[PDB]
Amino acid sequence: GAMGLPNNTASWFTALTQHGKEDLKFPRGQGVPINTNSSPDDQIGYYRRATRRIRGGDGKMKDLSPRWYFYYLGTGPEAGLPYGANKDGIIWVATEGALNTPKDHIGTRNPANNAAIVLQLPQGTTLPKGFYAEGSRGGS
């Protein structure tokens, strides 16, 4: 049947978009995007794979490219995901000083009320080859 539980829980940031053969992976102690709305312990999280399509009657597709959104550790009430838990399209990331405890309190963002932040990485940290961020540009 349909599912419509009252749990919106939207990622704070815009999508990362892949163009390549890899899916997405960040090295140890790195990968956490600039969280302007979080404490230094709150930085811990993961990126969640996402795509979006619709069903046109005549088979029409939207076919948005593979994307990733950043989500904080333990977002979603019954998510059942501790840090490092293996799940499809899930890559755990943390930085120094980040605490291994849940912080669902950040992911209560409503996209109807606020706009997502352009995903950025901190100074000295670069996206892997073939990845770019939604709403981000270079130059200017």
Distance of CA 135 to the CA centre of its chain: 14
Q: Which residues participate in the annotated binding site?
A: 52, 67, 109
Express the helix, strand and coil content of the chain in percent, nearest 5 each.
Answer: 0, 15, 80
Q: Which residues participate in the annotated binding site for RNA?
A: 52, 67, 109
Per the document, the length of the chain is 140
According to the entry, how was the structure determined? Answer: NMR
